[PDB]
Write the structure tokens for this entry.
Amino acid sequence: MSLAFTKTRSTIGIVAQPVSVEVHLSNGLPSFTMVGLAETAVKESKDRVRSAIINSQFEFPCRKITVNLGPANLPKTGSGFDLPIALGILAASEQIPLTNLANHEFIGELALSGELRGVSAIIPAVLAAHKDNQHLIIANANAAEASLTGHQKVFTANNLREVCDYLCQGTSLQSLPPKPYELDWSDIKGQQHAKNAMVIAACGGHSILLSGAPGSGKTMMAKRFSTLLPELSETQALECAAINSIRGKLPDFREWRLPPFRAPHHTASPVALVGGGNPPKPGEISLAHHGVLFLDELPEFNRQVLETLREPLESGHICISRAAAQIEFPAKFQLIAAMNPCPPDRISRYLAKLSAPLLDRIDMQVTIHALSQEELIKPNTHLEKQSLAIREKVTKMHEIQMARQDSLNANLNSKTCEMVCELGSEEQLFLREVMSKLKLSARGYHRLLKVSRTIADMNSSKKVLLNHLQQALSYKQNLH
Amino acid sequence: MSLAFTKTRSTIGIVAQPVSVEVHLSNGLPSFTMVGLAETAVKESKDRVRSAIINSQFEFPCRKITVNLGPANLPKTGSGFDLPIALGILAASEQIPLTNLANHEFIGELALSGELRGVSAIIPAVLAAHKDNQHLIIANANAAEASLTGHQKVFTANNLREVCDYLCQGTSLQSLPPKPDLLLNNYELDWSDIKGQQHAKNAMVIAACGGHSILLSGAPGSGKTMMAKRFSTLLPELSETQALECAAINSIRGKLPDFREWRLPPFRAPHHTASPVALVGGGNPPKPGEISLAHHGVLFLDELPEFNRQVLETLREPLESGHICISRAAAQIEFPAKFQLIAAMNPCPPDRISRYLAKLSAPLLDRIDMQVTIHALSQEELIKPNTHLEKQSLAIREKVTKMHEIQMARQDSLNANLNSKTCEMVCELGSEEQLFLREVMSKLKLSARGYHRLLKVSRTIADMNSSKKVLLNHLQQALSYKQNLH
Amino acid sequence: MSLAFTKTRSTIGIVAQPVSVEVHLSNGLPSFTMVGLAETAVKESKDRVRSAIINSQFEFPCRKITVNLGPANLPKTGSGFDLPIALGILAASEQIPLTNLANHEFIGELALSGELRGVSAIIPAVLAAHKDNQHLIIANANAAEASLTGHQKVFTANNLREVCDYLCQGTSLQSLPPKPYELDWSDIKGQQHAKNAMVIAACGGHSILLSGAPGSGKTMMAKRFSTLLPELSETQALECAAINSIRGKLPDFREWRLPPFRAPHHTASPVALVGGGNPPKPGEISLAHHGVLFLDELPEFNRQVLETLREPLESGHICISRAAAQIEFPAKFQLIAAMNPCPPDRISRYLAKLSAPLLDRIDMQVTIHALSQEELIKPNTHLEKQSLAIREKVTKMHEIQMARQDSLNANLNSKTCEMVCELGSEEQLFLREVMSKLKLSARGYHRLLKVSRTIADMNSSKKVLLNHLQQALSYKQNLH
DNA sequence: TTTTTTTTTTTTTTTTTTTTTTTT
DNA sequence: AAAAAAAAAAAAAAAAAAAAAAAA
Ligand SMILES: Nc1ncnc2c1ncn2[C@@H]1O[C@H](COP(=O)(O)OP(=O)(O)NP(=O)(O)O)[C@@H](O)[C@H]1O
Ligand SMILES: Nc1ncnc2c1ncn2[C@@H]1O[C@H](COP(=O)(O)OP(=O)(O)NP(=O)(O)O)[C@@H](O)[C@H]1O
Ligand SMILES: Nc1ncnc2c1ncn2[C@@H]1O[C@H](COP(=O)(O)OP(=O)(O)NP(=O)(O)O)[C@@H](O)[C@H]1O
């Protein structure tokens, strides 16, 4: 027969929607109809495919060629449809045995020499192909991007002849290159209490507010914090890489498994810091996925932008919807905020500037003082690295909390929060007494319980103790 | 001569308007013409249908073909016009007996091998076909989506050969898979999670039992949002006839309902920064907004003082009528929006409050049946664990089911949707009740609509008390839920 | 087969994307198909190429032509695609040996007689071809514009026959004509102290602050401060030329191998001073790239634009976006600011309204005492031409500084400025009592250490000896 | 008094439909 | 002979200028 089927993937936003390239060589006169809502592949892929096939010592059908791309009601954007179309034409013309086209995808754009150039935003395609247990044969120019995954059964090719031989024959095509922290917690000299609070915050996945005078080192703590976080798992690292390449370029292989850290400037722009429209562009909120987001000088952020942060903090994703489409763009980040503890009624106005809806779901608050000149001038003779052991500790604590349930201590709800904390009478009377002394709100009490559970788990205690609650109180409260 | 008249459906908004594909072969040179305002997505079905016909071992006419997908005013958008066109071509080429197409509606998309593909937004077409008594034939990929309807006159096929064999000889096609029966026992939510907010928990229970809109006022931290979220569990499951109306909107806007919550009342909580186009109706080819997506469910408006007033002013029409006539200067769609409203507001963010107040629309707050002040939860009921945790959602849901069922006796409409033949009459106000109402009204400075929206609330309370008439104590309870602001 | 590849450039904004023109001659009927999102100006080059080849005593193929222009997803705008396409056609038709087209890059449109014509925005293409070490061949009309940069290995032709002759047998092809000011640092009046402060600032790359009565000086010394900095390399000169070209003017007479100097007036503009809008254009900040930015009367301007300078001051670039594109311009400069000693609370408010976060980044501060008649005896102070020796010393200083670590003293962090300053016990002893005298912030302390390291490294010292630290204490910040 | 922010209006931009000059 | 190259209109959104409401 003269009917062939091929597979590829079109990237809209962050998802790679599967496409089904269908070629049917009729018996009429030379034609190359390309039905399916292609925009720039319509009249351009035709000539590139023709020349690439001819120059690779192949017969180009002298027939009526009809190419139908995937779902009809789906615009198709990229230029990587030249390789699937060329292979479909060859299969339909019997120059390739089509019995071996079932399990393989194809992505790439063909030059006029038959060579394979490199398309953009390829890692999402690799993810989708591996998820479906399909071989993904890409151009050599994308070998660097594809090698991050190290997924087996993926290959790369130099030109079309290499792929045609890999299909007709079984020659190994190219495979992939095997797999082509510097700050450390130690640099934070003599802060003690704040460092320990940040350590337990990392261990519990809590969000922490850093209040202190200017030049106290808040930004340094935020920058060094990401060393605490455990190295991203393979799947999380691949998700981060996918969200990255949608924007272009990849200076990876030195940090590809270190959690992201974003510190948007307090001016920024709502569309940039939150999602993105037009062709869906992830915002600074989304590049922090599985990582840390540092909102420096929180009050100077406009409340309108901060109001949107309530969605991703609670859902783990942020969907931005336009008249055209709405995309997922996961935003499962960990928040860190910084703010000056006010300089009079000016203090009241300053605290009024801040967005209560966001500040009420920040699980922690630590006050930072300027350094002691004795420690500031003393040398960093205590150069022993320590972030390594703390990272292993955080891994252990997160594993415990996952063992309890899929929700970290930071994401427990009221019912599960009360069910997981033992909260015996011994601690209950003290808790009632303190609440009588200081009037915590409904959610402040549960934040206190969550932080107390984090501390208790850190100490390996099977149950929350009064000492743990007394410790958690110090890291509790908002503002003065 | 040979011409064929195949039927199909085109969706414009929520209604699937019938379309009559009309193929006609002439003896001229082998061209191919499509009329009837065919969009590009459907104007390129020419070669696709040609290939799907040739590959299925048929004879594609070498003749001047002329398709007429039109009532000439309606533009055709979907991609499901390939199966009707292919069958029309075959019937007009005498390869299919034209009497087989007597009362069938075909919806499908053809690949280049004849294999059928799944179109989107199929539920409205299935509903329309069922209402028209026509047989419907769809691609296998839509069998899962159309299984909810449970209509016995729908068939699914794998490729064009299957449909051709069915029409010519009737080889039974494939029927649709069984309806997805499931349970809801858990809900993972429960009415019990609300700890100690007893007074305001007994006011949502008589708003679920009377369709009354409810306004939640209170300081932050208290469980206004949590109570709103739990409210949906109170409402009874949706009657199939209503779950289909909701599933049509779900398919049109989103895709693939969950098959488990498809009979649970919807709960939508739009975020105040969302644009009016997303909240009310929609531009472009019209798409349901949040308001319509909450059809037959609960619309939770959090932070009522917020939201552009252009939106809150438009909610009067859905609350009175039940549908939003979104206009685009070319046509207006219906988009049913019969929802139950729940509001949340902060009574105080001096005389500066005048700026914060009046940002809302007074008539909207006048349309809200109830207002309950969520007091901050006290320490004794906050520290104390859930010593009592027996499930109440099931029992209360049974109560509301019974209360609704009884409520349809006098009038099917719920006591909230009851007019001045109900504020007077249905509410069998007695003499002593008349004097009590006279005294309280004269003492209280209330508008004329103030007198109304107690008779309905009092009737709801009486119905919960199984009293033939209001006993002068139900009115006493009702008064406590009226009033407004601080 | 009949298949030839040529190279050119496509200039958008400040970057000249590489484009690989690909030409294929098939056996079909006469035709001319372009590919790669070629605009009307590019896509109309068919007839121009045909006539230019025909009139140059060449043979235009009767076969079917098929030109594929570089990346398939990059629209092509410029009109300089006629020469690459003509050369590609000739190479594919065996009229030229295609080995010559290996490393050359061709630019410039073709008249209907075969004569070449100039094309706008040529400097970015020259820069890009320089970075890639590719022989660029341009129209003779563009020689008068390209040669000003003084870049070699670039040849200019008048007609297609000249280029064909050069490629076939290397017949000269002309060359960019030759490229066709004292400022005498010694001119500055007898300030001595401020001269030494400027010298250390240049040596270490520090940002310096100037104080004195309005118009009493500063600007006179600010102008000549640029003379001490080392001469720009060829690549840096071409970068500055490209930025000034996208601005839209570099005929003038600028000697591009010397550092620029920009002195925006304090009225300023939030768009011109930072970055251009509407059509992205370089702001005054980027025009100072690899130069000196002089912000006279710092208290002027506004408390927002000075915040946007925090990023480029350290990162070295400015990113301007309007949700439609992300445009990056280099902003590596050595900020020099000036301020009068304010015009009591009435005088405290003036310095209290300053941009504290940005001022904190200005390492140095000196006082310019006014002169009346002392310098009127010009001989014996102006008659030494002191610029050359200072520049030589600065070159050696930069070389040694970069040798110690890949960062100038002015861009070290709290880590290196302790591992490199290598203060012992007495050295660390002195600064403790100094800090006890004045408890400066951590940033001020590290600025002191950096200035002291600069001074020590000028004296061929192995460590930060006391004398150097005592000298560095001279400047500090003395806002009052 | 001695001084600044917030909100609205006008102008502008982008996208889509329309349109208007194409592609064959 | 058939659309896509284009000056126009509207939906929707954003920025700068301006009004003014507010505050030093
Ligand atoms: N342990 C430490 N505590 C505080 N500052 C430190 C410490 N170690 C080093 N520093 C230095 O202290 C300086 C303070 O800058 P930074 O850490 O950014 O504070 P900041 O609060 O972010 N700046 P600002 O927002 O204007 O107040 C940096 O230059 C650090 O290198
Ligand atoms: N019985 C209760 N009453 C009030 N709040 C509760 C109760 N039990 C738990 N909560 C808290 O309430 C949260 C959810 O409701 P809520 O505090 O109202 O969130 P919200 O979105 O901020 N609504 P609001 O309190 O009005 O701002 C839970 O996460 C708990 O922290
Ligand atoms: N004088 C009256 N006598 C009897 N019924 C009345 C009277 N005035 C109002 N109503 C009733 O009020 C109900 C609601 O109508 P109404 O409140 O007038 O609508 P509306 O005018 O759009 N609301 P508003 O904009 O606040 O005036 C009607 O169904 C009547 O029963």
Notes: Chain A has three domains: 3-168, 185-406, 412-480. Residues 412-480 of chain A form one domain. The interface with chain C takes residues 40, 44, 47-48, 50-51, 54-55, 78-79, 82, 109, 111-113, 117, 120, 187, 214-215, 217, 220, 265, 267, 269, 271-272, 276-278, 370-371, 373-374, 376-380 of chain A (CB under 8 Å). Chain A is about 35% helix and 15% strand.
